[PDB]
């Protein structure tokens, strides 16, 4: 509950501007650890924030996935809808 659905297109070089920590191999939830100024993650509707817990990536439940599996899902450009990365997050 209290979930926020964010869509964002990458910059011209394929970057979104956020960092993540966590994943199944780290025994902790996937959390946004940094959002860089002026990047898609900082300028989206609403902003992606540090501490937000990632629940879905492009509709996919990532609970049992490792950190690097989550990184590849973020970079999987063909799983985006209309070029937008979709994140379903829980604010801290």
């Amino acid at each position: 509950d209290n979930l926020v659905l964010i869509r964002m297109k990458p910059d011209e070089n394929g970057r979104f501007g956020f960092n993540v920590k966590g994943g199944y191999d780290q025994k902790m939830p996937v959390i946004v650890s940094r959002v860089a100024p002026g990047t898609p993650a900082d300028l989206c509707v609403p902003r992606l924030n540090e501490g937000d817990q990632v629940v879905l990536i492009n509709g996919r439940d990532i609970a049992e996935h490792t950190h690097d599996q989550v990184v590849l899902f973020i970079k999987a450009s063909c799983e985006r809808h209309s070029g937008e990365l979709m994140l379903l997050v829980r604010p801290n």
Partner: peptide, 13 residues
């Protein structure tokens, strides 16, 4: 990993 910098278990996307 996946052509993104990883350090301290944190990846830049």
């Amino acid at each position: 990993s996946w052509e993104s910098h990883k350090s301290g278990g944190e990846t830049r996307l």
